Amino acid sequence: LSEQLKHCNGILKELLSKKHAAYAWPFYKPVDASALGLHDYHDIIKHPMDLSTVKRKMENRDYRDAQEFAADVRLMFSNCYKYNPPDHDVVAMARKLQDVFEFRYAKMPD
């Protein structure tokens, strides 16, 4: 449980690392709908999520288990797939970062 949350923290550090920055950068901070002119974003996305919020929740010991952590990371990707045209670069970037996430999450010590 501690060990599983350390694995989750390792994944989070990797998703925020320079290695993945080319496709991870749209997920670093909350979507600023107003700044991007996406005035329908908060009508379509009821539960915004981003890696800075995941990092705050990890630092605050909000996550009680790996499943709660994974739920937030996957919510972040789901929001991207729900809102954006499926042929837009941001969806390709989501797919690439979710591939990194899912393959390493699958190696959870258990």
Ligand X SMILES: CNC(=O)c1cc(C(=O)N[C@H]2CC[C@H](O)CC2)n([C@@H](C)c2ccccc2)n1
**Is 31 a binder of ligand X (CB under 6 A)?**
yes
Q: In angstroms, rounded to a whole number, what is the distance separating the alpha carbons of residues 57 and 5?
A: 12
CA distances from 80 to 50, 63, 92 (A): 10, 22, 10
Radius of gyration of the chain (CA): 14
To ligand X, the closest distance from the beta carbon of 45 in angstroms equals: 8
Q: Which of 90, 96, 100, 108 binds ligand X (CB under 6 A)?
A: 90
Q: Which of 83, 97, 98, 101 binds ligand X (CB under 6 A)?
A: 83
Token couple for 20 = 């993945």
Q: In angstroms, rounded to a whole number, what is the distance separating the alpha carbons of residues 43 and 41?
A: 6
Q: Which of 1, 18, 36, 110 binds ligand X (CB under 6 A)?
A: 36
Under a CB-based contact definition with an 8 Å cutoff, are residues 27 and 95 in contact?
no
**Is 65 a binder of ligand X (CB under 6 A)?**
no
**Is 48 a binder of ligand X (CB under 6 A)?**
no
Which residue is nearest to ligand X, using beta carbons? 90
The binding site for ligand X (CB under 6 A) comprises: 26-27, 31, 36, 80, 83-85, 88-90, 93
